Ligand binder design. Sequence first.
Ligand SMILES: OC[C@H]1O[C@@H](O[C@H]2[C@H](O)[C@@H](O)[C@@H](O)O[C@@H]2CO)[C@H](O)[C@@H](O)[C@H]1O
Ligand SMILES: OC[C@H]1O[C@@H](O[C@H]2[C@H](O)[C@@H](O)[C@@H](O)O[C@@H]2CO)[C@H](O)[C@@H](O)[C@H]1O
Ligand SMILES: OC[C@H]1O[C@@H](O[C@H]2[C@H](O)[C@@H](O)[C@@H](O)O[C@@H]2CO)[C@H](O)[C@@H](O)[C@H]1O
Ligand SMILES: OC[C@H]1O[C@@H](O[C@H]2[C@H](O)[C@@H](O)[C@@H](O)O[C@@H]2CO)[C@H](O)[C@@H](O)[C@H]1O
Ligand SMILES: [Ca+2]
Ligand SMILES: [Ca+2]
Ligand SMILES: [Ca+2]
Ligand SMILES: [Ca+2]
Ligand SMILES: [Mn+2]
Ligand SMILES: [Mn+2]
Ligand SMILES: [Mn+2]
Ligand SMILES: [Mn+2]
Lengths: 232, 232, 232, 232
Amino acid sequence: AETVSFNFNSFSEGNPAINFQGDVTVLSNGNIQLTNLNKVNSVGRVLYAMPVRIWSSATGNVASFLTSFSFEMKDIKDYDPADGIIFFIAPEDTQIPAGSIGGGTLGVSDTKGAGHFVGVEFDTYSNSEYNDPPTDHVGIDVNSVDSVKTVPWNSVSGAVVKVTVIYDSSTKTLSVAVTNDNGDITTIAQVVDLKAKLPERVKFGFSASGSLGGRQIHLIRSWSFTSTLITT
Amino acid sequence: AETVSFNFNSFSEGNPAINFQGDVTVLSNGNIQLTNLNKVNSVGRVLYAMPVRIWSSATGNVASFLTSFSFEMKDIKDYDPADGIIFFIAPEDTQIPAGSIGGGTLGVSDTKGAGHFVGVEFDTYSNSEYNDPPTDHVGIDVNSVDSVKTVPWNSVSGAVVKVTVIYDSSTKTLSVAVTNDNGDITTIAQVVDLKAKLPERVKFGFSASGSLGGRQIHLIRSWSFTSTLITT
Amino acid sequence: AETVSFNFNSFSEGNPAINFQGDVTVLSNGNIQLTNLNKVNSVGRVLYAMPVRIWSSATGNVASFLTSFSFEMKDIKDYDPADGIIFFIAPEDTQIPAGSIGGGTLGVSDTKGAGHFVGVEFDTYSNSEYNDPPTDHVGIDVNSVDSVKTVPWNSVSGAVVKVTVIYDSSTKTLSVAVTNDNGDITTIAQVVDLKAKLPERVKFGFSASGSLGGRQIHLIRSWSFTSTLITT
Amino acid sequence: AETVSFNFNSFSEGNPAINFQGDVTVLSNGNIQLTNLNKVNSVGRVLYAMPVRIWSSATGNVASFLTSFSFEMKDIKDYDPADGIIFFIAPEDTQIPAGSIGGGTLGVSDTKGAGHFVGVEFDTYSNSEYNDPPTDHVGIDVNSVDSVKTVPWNSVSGAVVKVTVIYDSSTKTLSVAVTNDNGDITTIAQVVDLKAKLPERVKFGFSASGSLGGRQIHLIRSWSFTSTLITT
Ligand SMILES: OC[C@H]1O[C@@H](O[C@H]2[C@H](O)[C@@H](O)[C@@H](O)O[C@@H]2CO)[C@H](O)[C@@H](O)[C@H]1O
Ligand SMILES: OC[C@H]1O[C@@H](O[C@H]2[C@H](O)[C@@H](O)[C@@H](O)O[C@@H]2CO)[C@H](O)[C@@H](O)[C@H]1O
Ligand SMILES: OC[C@H]1O[C@@H](O[C@H]2[C@H](O)[C@@H](O)[C@@H](O)O[C@@H]2CO)[C@H](O)[C@@H](O)[C@H]1O
Ligand SMILES: OC[C@H]1O[C@@H](O[C@H]2[C@H](O)[C@@H](O)[C@@H](O)O[C@@H]2CO)[C@H](O)[C@@H](O)[C@H]1O
Ligand SMILES: [Ca+2]
Ligand SMILES: [Ca+2]
Ligand SMILES: [Ca+2]
Ligand SMILES: [Ca+2]
Ligand SMILES: [Mn+2]
Ligand SMILES: [Mn+2]
Ligand SMILES: [Mn+2]
Ligand SMILES: [Mn+2]
């Protein structure tokens, strides 16, 4: 089988194994800070530089993957804690949408909320334009920030959140387990045909954004990942 | 919310949080050995002593849970490396089946391979009487060792295996991510309505067994667990 | 290490992790109400259902623990706001003393004030028969409600009180930090050898009581706890 | 009573409430990074700007206090993870020792390891010149980094540690509870006469240092404090 595996307990600007897009910046503590607190409509994204083959066009097999990462979102004086973080999968040539307004687009979609990607969003602001639930939530996104499915969640400022994601190729099931600071877990699963939605080779990464009045600290602390594609 | 969470990096006899059934033994390194290498049809089971309420008859809600554990199976001279380990969920009054023949029953079912439990098996011997695939495998079991679903797997002697399981109550999806020593991951997912198959109060644990000719070292090295039930 | 850890931000009847004894009742808001305002000499106790091994006779080791909890006492019309709440540790077979008169015994001692337990009381009535200080007070109790040591305190009706207790096994020191509604803190420390006073396995819990004329609302709002025993 | 209370969920340079000394720096995420990874023998300290009266020469009373804080230490490529962080109490005019060599001095003692301060150290390097234990450890220091008492500990890279400290004026006991990432707790308590070792007006703060070959990330994430002095 074809396996791609990597582990990051801290990051560094200059590490070729990672693509930095937008306002992303690396702190002296190794944390990746996605958005710039001073910029309006800030958008920052980080992608694993090596594209991953999530499915074979020859066998029709989709890859199974296991990934876990930890992030932290914190409030900053006088700004609404917005808009959130999104773990996404997109075509290998993905870039921040031209003229991105940040905000509820989470840095992965156009103004209508459309884009080419599959991801798990940790949404901390309710955008009625994208049919967001009234509270903070974790959502499964398929080519749109208008979630296919969401579950109520609570974003605690300064809290380190651990997330585990399992994608089972056979069932095409995407399940997420979120471990909040207080020990409680929040889960959400959704069948998503990766081969029908994305190209053979994709890139994995994170993205976050802010608006003029909505800004907060978005940090990726660590990230381990393993994908296995059966080639037979 | 109602959360039960525990983390075992090592075990020690005398700990009231752990119930031992059968040929279980605690090694000095803190590892648990499930079967006795000198006994015919050995069965060993370890359970979290406290019953967990996976669903509420009052709200009809089912709990979501996230658990990861690591184990090791090592061949011993002369015996067939069998029969494996099973991570199961059973009624709180669960006991080793009376007159258990061990072997392919994995210590959780009767001779016909039937019993009251839901589990994830790491089967290393092909029992045709229970329709086992021809190779080592991982399987989702529901009241039977005749798996509802299996996925080809490989048990490497002396290899430390890491497993992560997510049960999403909303979708009733049980997903398993197995990480082999060589970095490759194996996944298997299955929709299982815990509320329909199990009583409100259950116990979680591991069971291993052998036969006269089938014997091998079965080790549980660690186990972390978190279940969250919505009480409103 | 052998660690037992739990966290309760709210409670609900049916959670097997909790044992109720006496007139305990769970409110719709998730709070636990210890006594029944309509019963004479009411006594209500809640205990963590799983026995904890605070010390090993095999190693002579004693565990250290950190626990924090919040409670509230509210006066009711024209009953005496009596008699208080007590956080205690007792043998796992602990039951409300037979023929308990409640009142000043706080639900853990006999009529003479004797019992088998260690605890921290938040006393709101002064029982001369138990040598209570003339005012409300926090006290360290060892097998008796005739506190080994007390510190003046003031129970404010309707006020939420936060408590932090640290037990350092090495020095056998039990220190308590009580944070009042107004912001001030009250502390009390006392060396207590748990190994000498209690058996290896015990239970932690809260007890409250009243009498015929002494009754009030005793509420347990939250409770987090962690103990670690060195097994080596 | 005279009570001083403050709570920081994030810090920032320019906040008059805090004094910065040495190589301290405030990351955009609100975290305080005590040492400079690029400087040899780096020392950074942070203090609550306002001196706190711990004892009174008039009444002879000593204040009790409750304080908890969280920090994080993480390794950096090719540098020994040293030397650690220390929560200290010192005269209101306390300064980084003249000609400090950082390293095992933790930025509070001279070359011989002497200084005017009381503190709890989270020591990650074994300096035999100060009689350190052979492993990472937590220690109570009184005017010397030659801890009056230490307890075995383990500094996990990238893990967020929570510390709770209670000082009971009555028994003059200083007990510390350290909650590790894996949930285990470590405690240490020592009787310390603040009145005899420190002036009436003191300053609380954190200090960390490194050497040429010894460097690591030292972050202070949050800090709440409450001291109450009985003025009668
Ligand atoms: O409050 C945060 C949200 O802001 C929305 O945009 C605001 C913008 O921040 C404000 O300055 C003004 O222009 O009104 C806009 C419309 O609400 C974002 O659209 C939303 O995503 C949040 O970031
Ligand atoms: O070889 C391992 C398998 O043994 C099977 O039982 C054998 C037994 O070991 C042998 O001594 C003889 O009695 O024949 C039995 C039937 O094949 C178990 O049934 C199977 O589960 C494996 O353990
Ligand atoms: O007033 C509260 C105290 O009452 C004492 O008991 C009283 C009882 O309430 C009253 O009805 C009558 O029977 O006299 C008793 C003796 O004083 C309790 O002993 C004390 O603990 C408080 O609850
Ligand atoms: O390795 C960390 C320890 O370093 C010790 O100092 C070293 C110094 O880092 C190195 O450059 C060379 O000069 O040898 C010194 C002697 O060991 C510190 O004394 C110790 O506290 C640690 O930081
Ligand atoms: Ca949104
Ligand atoms: Ca089998
Ligand atoms: Ca009393
Ligand atoms: Ca040192
Ligand atoms: Mn959304
Ligand atoms: Mn099988
Ligand atoms: Mn009393
Ligand atoms: Mn030291």
